[PDB]
Design a protein around this ligand. Structure first.
Ligand SMILES: [Cl-]
Ligand SMILES: [Cl-]
Ligand SMILES: [Cl-]
Ligand SMILES: [Cl-]
Length: 262
C-alpha cells in the first residue's frame, strides 16, 4: 500500500488484497482494499496441523483450545464484513470449505480451479503422448470437478461466484456454469520465464530478461483480451509484477489482485 497507490492513481476502482495473515489483512482493510481474498482451505490445513504441534510439543495451552483459535479466525474476518463496505472473498477447492465459508458469511465465493486445471492439462498432454484415450477422459474429469462446484453453487443460490484459473478456456467454461467473476492468475508464467533466463549461458544479461518476462506478460494479457471478446464483464488479474498488473487494467481487467510480494 506504500507502493500500490500507483495503481490507485490510474483507473483504480477495484483493488483486491490476497493474504491469510490477519495483520496484513487488517492493514489492507484500513488502507482501502476493496476486496480481501482469504483461503479457507489454507486456513484449514494450518488448523489441523496446529493442534498437531500441541500434541508434539508437550503443551496444554494449545490442546483443548484449538477450537477457540479456529473460531477466532472466522470472527475477526466476519467483524470486518460488518464494520465496512470492504468485501470478503473466501477461496477453496474443497466443497465443504465453500459451504462453511458461505455459512460463516462471504460476499464472494471463489471456486479455485488453478491446481486442478493444471493437473488436468498435464494429464491431457500425457495422454496425447501415450496415445491413450482413456487418460484423456480421466484428464477431463479433473476440470469438471471444479466446474461442478460452480454450477452447484449456482443451483443452491450463491450470489457472487468466482473462479480462478490461468487459461481463458477454463474460465469461459466456468462462466457458462455460473461463475460471474473470472480470475486470471499469471504468477506461474512469470516464474517460469524467470527460471529460464537463469538457465541461459548469460543469466546476468539484463537485456535478455526484459522481453522474456514481457512475453510471459503478453500471455497473461491474452487471457484477459480473449475473455473480453467472449463478453465477460468482471475480470480479475493476479500478478506479482508491477507492469503486468498495470497493463492488464487497460486490457479489460477491472479487478487487480495484489499481495505482500507487491
Ligand atoms: Cl489420443
Ligand atoms: Cl455468496
Ligand atoms: Cl484468488
Ligand atoms: Cl486449459
Amino acid at each position: 500500500w506504500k507502493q500500490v497507490e500507483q495503481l490507485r492513481r490510474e483507473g483504480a476502482t477495484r483493488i483486491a488484497y490476497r493474504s491469510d495473515d490477519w495483520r496484513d489483512l487488517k492493514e489492507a482493510w484500513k488502507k482501502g482494499a476493496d476486496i480481501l481474498i482469504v483461503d479457507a482451505s489454507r486456513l484449514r490445513e494450518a488448523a489441523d496441523a496446529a493442534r498437531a504441534a500441541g500434541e508434539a510439543t508437550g503443551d496444554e495451552e494449545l490442546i483443548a483450545k484449538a477450537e477457540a483459535y479456529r473460531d477466532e479466525a472466522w470472527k475477526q474476518v466476519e467483524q470486518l464484513r460488518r464494520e465496512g463496505a470492504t468485501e470478503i472473498a473466501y477461496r477453496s477447492d474443497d466443497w465443504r470449505d465453500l459451504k462453511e465459508a458461505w455459512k460463516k458469511g462471504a460476499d464472494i465465493l471463489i471456486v479455485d480451479g488453478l491446481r486442478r486445471g493444471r493437473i488436468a492439462r498435464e494429464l491431457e498432454r500425457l495422454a496425447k503422448e501415450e496415445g491413450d484415450p482413456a487418460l484423456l477422459a480421466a484428464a477431463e474429469a479433473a476440470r469438471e470437478a471444479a466446474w461442478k462446484q460452480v454450477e452447484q453453487l449456482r443451483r443452491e443460490g450463491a450470489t457472487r461466484i468466482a473462479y480462478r484459473s490461468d487459461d481463458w478456456r477454463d474460465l469461459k467454461e466456468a462462466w457458462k456454469k455460473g461463475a460471474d467473476i473470472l480470475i486470471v492468475d499469471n504468477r506461474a508464467r512469470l516464474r517460469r520465464a524467470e527460471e529460464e533466463v537463469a538457465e541461459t549461458g548469460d543469466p546476468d544479461n539484463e537485456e535478455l530478461i526484459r522481453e522474456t518476462r514481457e512475453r510471459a506478460r503478453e500471455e497473461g494479457w491474452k487471457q484477459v483480451e480473449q475473455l473480453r471478446r467472449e463478453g465477460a464483464t468482471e475480470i480479475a488479474y493476479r500478478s506479482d509484477d508491477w507492469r503486468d498488473l498495470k497493463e492488464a487494467w487497460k486490457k479489460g481487467a477491472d479487478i487487480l489482485i495484489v499481495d505482500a510480494t507487491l
